Write a protein that binds this ligand. Sequence first.
Ligand SMILES: *[C@@H]1O[C@H](CO)[C@@H](O[C@@H]2O[C@H](CO)[C@@H](O)[C@H](O)[C@H]2NC(C)=O)[C@H](O)[C@H]1NC(C)=O
Ligand SMILES: *[C@@H]1O[C@H](CO)[C@@H](O[C@@H]2O[C@H](CO)[C@@H](O)[C@H](O)[C@H]2NC(C)=O)[C@H](O)[C@H]1NC(C)=O
Ligand SMILES: *[C@@H]1O[C@H](CO)[C@@H](O[C@@H]2O[C@H](CO)[C@@H](O)[C@H](O)[C@H]2NC(C)=O)[C@H](O)[C@H]1NC(C)=O
Ligand SMILES: *[C@@H]1O[C@H](CO)[C@@H](O[C@@H]2O[C@H](CO)[C@@H](O)[C@H](O)[C@H]2NC(C)=O)[C@H](O)[C@H]1NC(C)=O
Ligand SMILES: *[C@@H]1O[C@H](CO)[C@@H](O[C@@H]2O[C@H](CO)[C@@H](O)[C@H](O)[C@H]2NC(C)=O)[C@H](O)[C@H]1NC(C)=O
Ligand SMILES: *[C@@H]1O[C@H](CO)[C@@H](O[C@@H]2O[C@H](CO)[C@@H](O)[C@H](O)[C@H]2NC(C)=O)[C@H](O)[C@H]1NC(C)=O
Ligand SMILES: *[C@@H]1O[C@H](CO)[C@@H](O[C@@H]2O[C@H](CO)[C@@H](O)[C@H](O)[C@H]2NC(C)=O)[C@H](O)[C@H]1NC(C)=O
Ligand SMILES: *[C@@H]1O[C@H](CO)[C@@H](O[C@@H]2O[C@H](CO)[C@@H](O)[C@H](O)[C@H]2NC(C)=O)[C@H](O)[C@H]1NC(C)=O
Ligand SMILES: *[C@@H]1O[C@H](CO)[C@@H](O[C@@H]2O[C@H](CO)[C@@H](O)[C@H](O)[C@H]2NC(C)=O)[C@H](O)[C@H]1NC(C)=O
Ligand SMILES: *[C@@H]1O[C@H](CO)[C@@H](O)[C@H](O)[C@H]1NC(C)=O
Ligand SMILES: *[C@@H]1O[C@H](CO)[C@@H](O)[C@H](O)[C@H]1NC(C)=O
Ligand SMILES: *[C@@H]1O[C@H](CO)[C@@H](O)[C@H](O)[C@H]1NC(C)=O
Ligand SMILES: *[C@@H]1O[C@H](CO)[C@@H](O)[C@H](O)[C@H]1NC(C)=O
Ligand SMILES: *[C@@H]1O[C@H](CO)[C@@H](O)[C@H](O)[C@H]1NC(C)=O
Ligand SMILES: *[C@@H]1O[C@H](CO)[C@@H](O)[C@H](O)[C@H]1NC(C)=O
Ligand SMILES: *[C@@H]1O[C@H](CO)[C@@H](O)[C@H](O)[C@H]1NC(C)=O
Ligand SMILES: *[C@@H]1O[C@H](CO)[C@@H](O)[C@H](O)[C@H]1NC(C)=O
Lengths: 435, 435, 435, 124, 124, 124
Amino acid sequence: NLWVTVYYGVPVWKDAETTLFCASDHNVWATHCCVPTDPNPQEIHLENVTEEFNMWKNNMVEQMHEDIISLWDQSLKPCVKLTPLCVTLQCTNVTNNITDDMRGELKNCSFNMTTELRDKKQKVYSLFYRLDVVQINKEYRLINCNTSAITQACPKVSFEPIPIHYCAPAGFAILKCKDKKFNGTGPCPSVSTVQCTHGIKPVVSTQLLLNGSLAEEEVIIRSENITNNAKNILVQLNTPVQINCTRPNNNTVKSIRIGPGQWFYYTGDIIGDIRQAHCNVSKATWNETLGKVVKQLRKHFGNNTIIRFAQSSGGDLEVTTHSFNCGGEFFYCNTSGLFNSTWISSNDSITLPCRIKQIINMWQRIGQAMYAPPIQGVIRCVSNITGLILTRDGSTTETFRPGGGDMRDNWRSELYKYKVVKIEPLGVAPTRCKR
Amino acid sequence: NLWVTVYYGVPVWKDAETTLFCASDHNVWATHCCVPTDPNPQEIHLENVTEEFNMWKNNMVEQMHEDIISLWDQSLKPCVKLTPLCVTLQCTNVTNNITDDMRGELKNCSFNMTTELRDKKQKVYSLFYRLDVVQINKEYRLINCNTSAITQACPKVSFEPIPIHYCAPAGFAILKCKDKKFNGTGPCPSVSTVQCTHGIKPVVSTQLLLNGSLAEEEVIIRSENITNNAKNILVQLNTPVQINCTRPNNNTVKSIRIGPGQWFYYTGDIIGDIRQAHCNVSKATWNETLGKVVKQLRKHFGNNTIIRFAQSSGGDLEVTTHSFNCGGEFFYCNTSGLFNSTWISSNDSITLPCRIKQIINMWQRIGQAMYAPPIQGVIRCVSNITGLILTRDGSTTETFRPGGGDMRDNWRSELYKYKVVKIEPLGVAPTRCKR
Amino acid sequence: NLWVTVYYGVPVWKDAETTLFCASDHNVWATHCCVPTDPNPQEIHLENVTEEFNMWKNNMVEQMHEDIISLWDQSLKPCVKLTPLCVTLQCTNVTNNITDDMRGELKNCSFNMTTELRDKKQKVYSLFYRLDVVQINKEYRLINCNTSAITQACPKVSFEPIPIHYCAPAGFAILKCKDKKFNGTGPCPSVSTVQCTHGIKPVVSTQLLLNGSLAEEEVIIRSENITNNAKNILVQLNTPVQINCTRPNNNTVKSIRIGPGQWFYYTGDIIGDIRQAHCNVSKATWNETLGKVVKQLRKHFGNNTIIRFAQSSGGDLEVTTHSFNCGGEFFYCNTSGLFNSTWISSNDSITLPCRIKQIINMWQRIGQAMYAPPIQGVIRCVSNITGLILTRDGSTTETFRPGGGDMRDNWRSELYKYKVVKIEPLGVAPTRCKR
Amino acid sequence: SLGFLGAAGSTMGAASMTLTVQARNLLSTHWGIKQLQARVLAVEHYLRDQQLLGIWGCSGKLICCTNVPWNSSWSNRNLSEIWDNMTWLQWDKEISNYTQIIYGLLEESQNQQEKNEQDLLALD
Amino acid sequence: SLGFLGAAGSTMGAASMTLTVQARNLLSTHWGIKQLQARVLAVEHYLRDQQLLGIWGCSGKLICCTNVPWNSSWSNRNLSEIWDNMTWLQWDKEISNYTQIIYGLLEESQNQQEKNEQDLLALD
Amino acid sequence: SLGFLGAAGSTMGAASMTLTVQARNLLSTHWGIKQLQARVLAVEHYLRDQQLLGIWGCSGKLICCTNVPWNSSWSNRNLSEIWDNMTWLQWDKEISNYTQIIYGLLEESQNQQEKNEQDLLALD
Ligand SMILES: *[C@@H]1O[C@H](CO)[C@@H](O[C@@H]2O[C@H](CO)[C@@H](O)[C@H](O)[C@H]2NC(C)=O)[C@H](O)[C@H]1NC(C)=O
Ligand SMILES: *[C@@H]1O[C@H](CO)[C@@H](O[C@@H]2O[C@H](CO)[C@@H](O)[C@H](O)[C@H]2NC(C)=O)[C@H](O)[C@H]1NC(C)=O
Ligand SMILES: *[C@@H]1O[C@H](CO)[C@@H](O[C@@H]2O[C@H](CO)[C@@H](O)[C@H](O)[C@H]2NC(C)=O)[C@H](O)[C@H]1NC(C)=O
Ligand SMILES: *[C@@H]1O[C@H](CO)[C@@H](O[C@@H]2O[C@H](CO)[C@@H](O)[C@H](O)[C@H]2NC(C)=O)[C@H](O)[C@H]1NC(C)=O
Ligand SMILES: *[C@@H]1O[C@H](CO)[C@@H](O[C@@H]2O[C@H](CO)[C@@H](O)[C@H](O)[C@H]2NC(C)=O)[C@H](O)[C@H]1NC(C)=O
Ligand SMILES: *[C@@H]1O[C@H](CO)[C@@H](O[C@@H]2O[C@H](CO)[C@@H](O)[C@H](O)[C@H]2NC(C)=O)[C@H](O)[C@H]1NC(C)=O
Ligand SMILES: *[C@@H]1O[C@H](CO)[C@@H](O[C@@H]2O[C@H](CO)[C@@H](O)[C@H](O)[C@H]2NC(C)=O)[C@H](O)[C@H]1NC(C)=O
Ligand SMILES: *[C@@H]1O[C@H](CO)[C@@H](O[C@@H]2O[C@H](CO)[C@@H](O)[C@H](O)[C@H]2NC(C)=O)[C@H](O)[C@H]1NC(C)=O
Ligand SMILES: *[C@@H]1O[C@H](CO)[C@@H](O[C@@H]2O[C@H](CO)[C@@H](O)[C@H](O)[C@H]2NC(C)=O)[C@H](O)[C@H]1NC(C)=O
Ligand SMILES: *[C@@H]1O[C@H](CO)[C@@H](O)[C@H](O)[C@H]1NC(C)=O
Ligand SMILES: *[C@@H]1O[C@H](CO)[C@@H](O)[C@H](O)[C@H]1NC(C)=O
Ligand SMILES: *[C@@H]1O[C@H](CO)[C@@H](O)[C@H](O)[C@H]1NC(C)=O
Ligand SMILES: *[C@@H]1O[C@H](CO)[C@@H](O)[C@H](O)[C@H]1NC(C)=O
Ligand SMILES: *[C@@H]1O[C@H](CO)[C@@H](O)[C@H](O)[C@H]1NC(C)=O
Ligand SMILES: *[C@@H]1O[C@H](CO)[C@@H](O)[C@H](O)[C@H]1NC(C)=O
Ligand SMILES: *[C@@H]1O[C@H](CO)[C@@H](O)[C@H](O)[C@H]1NC(C)=O
Ligand SMILES: *[C@@H]1O[C@H](CO)[C@@H](O)[C@H](O)[C@H]1NC(C)=O
């Protein structure tokens, strides 16, 4: 009675993993290597389509991680190596204009450096931030000398994030979840199809998420398994919290030639008073924001429980402290002032002290160190806190502490709405015709 | 009435930019990397086809420039880095057999060089040409010690140009202009289709063009805009002018080890008298050649005007002199003896003095220097002047001077007759056929 | 009255050369970069198909040779360079516990090597195996300081062979010869089609082939031209001969930082007495094996001739000894104890003395040396001799000696049964059908 | 009207009227390797589907009626239940275990047809 | 027999006889990428033209007649002008603003025809 | 049953029943190029053969009958000597000298046919 009929161009798909390529509209992200974007991108709403999404098993996260690292490493390939700098240093304290916040934070180190001719030497002195220098026995060495080589970052290449769009190849498509209050793992009743994601800024931070997307209706709490303790909790905020960061010192940057065409940059001196770097968070905004987080946590922990916030328990500075790139300098800000409260059912700011490092080991790797040359003048940046990464301690009281450290969890906060599927245009069904 | 009929294989095309590949046939040009040639190619004459060519907007030029530079750099990747050569030199003058002209053009420099063993040193002396050595304070350094690393060119890799054929990919074709007396920018009434260009020799020179194609009827003068004095004028000759260049000194070349399997080559001594390098141009041939050039210039400047030739205006040697590679040595010849006349309507040569450099910065780049090892023995090369690069000064006399420096202008003299187009085989037309 | 009919999918092929790819299943063969294999590969027997094979013109051999070298080199690319280790050494003999087999084989050397900080030096003592060190005039140098750079092999990357399967791309197939007693050049009456070869272990050795395939019924003697003297003879055994190799010395390995994250590994001392490395071959098995080799050799040289075996006549250790990798160490074993007999129509083993080298120049290249770091403790390995490489001297007696050196002769002993063909599915034939 | 996959979720009968919407979007210095791999892969997938249509005798068509009868063991759902009350995503799941059976039948049928045509054309 | 683009410049009615001359010549150390990109691109262009012929119902043909009427608003010339005086390059430069209209119509026509055939065969 | 080239060695008329068997086996750091080139090449060969079938009017067929008569000068044998007593490898060698002639004739007869179809469809 019925016969097989073959159809081609059938609107079906399968979960699939493929390689995505970048689109992007002198940058550590090498955006000149990416495809120009569509000025009028399409988005096709799919009526009556419900899809299963799982942000924790999303391979787009892994590809972003690999591309970010590879772009980062490529940007250092043509830059001056600092092998000649791993020498014994003779260091004394910078005591000239200390406000007692900075005692012992800056050291004045002299050394013998190589020069353009290999049969000559020059005596150079510079200032270091302590975290980059370790004692040998007044004899000091740079901290990386017993672990890794250092490459100086090129002074002409910006580290500022530029939005990157991830695009599927022909034959593949990216489905986007449009539901509000979407927790990352359930079915998504309202979806649409795009070919490229929106641009995502590769912002690197360790405890708070900066300059991301906001939730529209409420604070959304997402985790792979909220009853475990082995998993981090990603909190997406509804409103931004503005944070003002500064390195309030006027640096004079000097440079020397250490070989043929090889320049080294360092801080020569500081003009005026020496003060600690710090970040400002308004108390009123922070208090409301944290209260919203608590309200949402109660949906899983009880309306009769106690929610306590505390400092990270310990570990490397890159984990326990909130790290970010501000104007080219790398800041390590203490968030103990943000997570110090117990919740039981004005222009008054919070000041977070910050430390600065020049020798940086990124992506939690060993053997590849970068030297961040100093920035001349005074640095100030303003950014938005759009989310948090928290962990929960293993009674009646739950305790949450800043987590993070692992970069893939930052990208999950932007990529949670997307999945890649393969288009399968060929298929069969019974019908009445035959031939 | 009439119906759309679809045709495939329609003989039409559009201007296009695509990637061309090389098919040329121990050399700096990787002719071994290129595709082998076709025994005989098929050139198809197109009757009744007129097409527009524009030699100044030809993207084949940009690709040739990029490929030549890339091949050039690849050939130096496996060669010795002369890092240990950038030392203080103790130099005196070579005075033993010096004639009055080449006086002070040779230095006898001694230095401390490394050996195969890290703990040993050797005292070495060698001859330098002054142009490649600068004074520090008797104490000298190599000219590029404060800007770049020097890579020694490999002694077994020839710098002699080998013709390279540029080939279109499938789906593309190269149109060629057969119009005699063609100036490069207008309609060409006689064209043909080829898959690959003729072989083009990547000859590098700065004021006179050497070993190129000749004009078939008369001297042809081409420029982007003949009334814009900021543009260069390319003059194609219909007759060669034979030029005889020599480095009439018998060099003894020495070699030392500088490291674990690395060797440095240098001039040890000179046997016999020391004489200035030079080039010979016949006076009669040169005067007839200029006569033809001015006759053609008058078509643009007036039949009652004055045409005057003068020397270069200034700048570094790469633009003020005529530079070329003769047997592996790099010559910088003074052409002031050629461009010295005012034009108003037997066995006697012009001698052009020349200087030699060993440290060379090609393609007007900074940071990548090459050391050309010396060639043992005595050098003589004979070449054809097939064209000129001229500039014009910014009211009865039009003064012309040698131009140069930008290498794309040399290529434009061989590629002016070619254009790349995309084949567009699919199209429609009305017919009386329906179904 | 017949018409041309076109058939597509016709089962025919042509001899062809294409690129084959690696399939496999922390190792120098980088098998993580290969395609995972098919757990259930197919083999299709072709009834009534006779093909010609020629193992001596088989391009699969050339590709394996190139892939093995490239995989080898990329595995040293990221490892520590030992450039700073080429210094004058002060050496004396190791005489503490000598069984005069080793009398003068080991030397105790001291030298000044670099440290993490440029201004500091470290005095190091280490043991060397003589073959790696040459006398300068007590003052010694590493043997390769005047020819090459040395790269230390990474201590974490194994040199143990992992079977590699070579696979044809779509449109190509590999035909396998199933005939027993096939000598590699004639017609093969019984063949089958496979897409991938069996796994071949890239065992690198000279004179004797280790861990290969055995002949099914009898010893098979294969050669390009049996009556020449310019060709080697490959003998495939039908039974293994077991060989037990060891270095009975409890070597203690030390590690010193030589730079910023760089480290050099060397033998510090030897626990217990110092003994010569050696290999054991049972006499009975060897004599039976050799007798079989002779029986099948008489087929080409006469059943009344005299067959004589002798030691290799000259050249470097790579060809005069049996080279192999045993536990990461590189052995050079003297086989004159095996090839010493004239053949005319319990637990007694042959002991072959062996020498050990650390500075290695593989694939007979010059300029790329490897330093094999020592392996701690006592090393023992057991392997199968599955074949021989023999040469024949240019009367009544034919003299044969071990051959080797050219690695393609080893791979050709495993790939002799395979050939690559291109499938040509389109063809025509006359039929009575017309349209 | 609808863009790429905009018909998903509509019933099969409706979705079949937009087949060209999807058909037209098929096929539409280390980092150049990712781009080439992406481009090559798209081509390979395109060609594999086209090869099957060739083998089955459906080359050049979006809708192809064949001579293989439908077996109730694959699915016994009524046509009014399939074409009007299901979308293609649901249908694909319902018969996903029988596609290899069906494909084998489709290629065998065409092979037999190739041979019968050849013989009829051999008669004068 | 005039060579690959030998008919260019001849009139449209002459040039239409060399369609296989042009069709057969289509589709026929970072340098490895440069060359490989050139090869991939040639394939992609070939396939896109074939895909359109597929969608329009002209697969496998060099000359294909369809059911879309010609509109005088696209071009209004006598057939003798088009086929006897003009060459294809000239034609391409006059009809270039209508190609995306014509292609759209060709697609709609073929899709409607396939639906009609499928329904008709329900009675076979 | 004789999964790939298993018919090789069988007679030409026997092997004619396994055409789909071979058709289905077509298309299915530094290395990232070596592997990619192998994939691209497989595609290029596939497409060259398909283009020839296309221009001969055999685009959708495994067995395509044509209008070019067989010449005894290419091969003068009987049908039972070719189809029953010979294999395809032998046949391919037997006429390897004339394949270019035959291909040229096939291209020409298809062109004559397409022009005639175009003219007939203009009469109504
Ligand atoms: C930089 O170089 C100077 C060389 O002038 C070093 O000064 C020498 O230091 C050593 C001890 O390390 C003394 O024994 C010498 O007498 C010093 N020489 C003189 C005359 O100064 C200096 O130590 C080096 N840099 C450091 C580490 O301070
Ligand atoms: C989510 O986390 C809970 C723990 O909070 C997991 O439940 C445990 O599973 C193990 C293994 O079966 C049992 O031994 C424990 O007793 C369970 N604990 C509790 C409190 O039930 C649960 O399996 C996790 N779910 C997923 C999908 O990973
Ligand atoms: C090369 O020849 C073309 C003609 O083939 C010249 O084209 C003229 O360009 C000017 C630009 O201002 C126009 O006003 C004229 O109408 C063009 N003439 C023609 C006949 O098209 C071009 O100027 C010549 N260039 C040189 C350097 O000689
Ligand atoms: C450039 O060199 C060529 C030779 O390479 C010179 O030609 C020679 O001229 C003399 C004098 O008239 C003749 O006796 C020779 O027979 C010619 N040689 C050859 C091979 O023909 C030419 O004159 C030189 N030109 C200049 C300007 O010096
Ligand atoms: C391997 O076996 C083949 C037979 O299959 C031998 O081929 C012959 O070579 C000899 C010497 O050239 C000729 O006399 C025969 O007429 C050849 N026969 C064929 C089939 O051509 C081949 O020589 C043998 N090779 C070895 C090393 O034993
Ligand atoms: C180029 O154009 C000329 C016309 O200018 C074409 O010549 C005509 O060819 C036809 C057909 O053979 C003859 O009937 C005419 O009498 C010819 N005209 C003249 C003036 O002789 C020529 O064929 C075209 N070239 C090409 C390759 O198509
Ligand atoms: C032929 O082309 C004309 C021009 O595009 C079409 O007429 C237009 O139709 C639209 C509605 O779709 C109107 O909004 C325009 O105002 C009309 N323009 C003109 C100039 O009349 C016409 O319908 C097409 N005819 C056919 C048979 O395709
Ligand atoms: C290989 O050749 C044998 C013949 O030597 C083929 O077997 C014959 O097949 C025909 C047709 O079915 C039978 O009538 C004969 O009786 C068979 N003869 C024998 C001796 O078995 C065999 O089919 C061929 N193999 C292949 C794959 O074609
Ligand atoms: C096709 O030609 C072959 C070879 O000529 C034929 O085989 C012979 O045919 C003749 C008749 O012409 C017989 O007398 C022979 O006995 C046949 N040879 C044998 C022993 O096979 C074949 O018969 C011809 N066509 C057919 C089969 O009718
Ligand atoms: C210098 O800093 C160290 C801490 O690293 C501190 O112990 C010492 O007292 C300081 N010296 C002076 C003079 O401030
Ligand atoms: C997300 O929603 C799904 C709905 O099925 C539920 O099972 C899961 O536990 C929820 N997870 C979180 C963190 O809210
Ligand atoms: C602060 O620094 C300035 C120089 O920038 C110096 O003149 C002044 O004396 C310093 N302050 C004190 C308390 O020493
Ligand atoms: C060291 O070995 C050499 C080997 O030639 C020998 O001549 C020398 O005497 C030995 N020295 C000692 C102390 O045994
Ligand atoms: C190390 O250097 C010192 C420099 O005084 C030298 O005397 C000593 O012999 C060197 N050591 C070795 C093993 O060569
Ligand atoms: C070498 O000697 C040490 C002595 O402490 C022992 O622990 C080790 O097991 C010995 N190794 C071998 C292979 O005998
Ligand atoms: C969704 O379902 C409604 C009926 O509830 C129907 O009218 C609408 O057309 C469907 N959407 C799509 C895209 O078919
Ligand atoms: C396919 O088979 C599995 C059992 O292996 C069964 O659970 C599933 O429902 C079947 N799917 C279909 C479409 O029949």
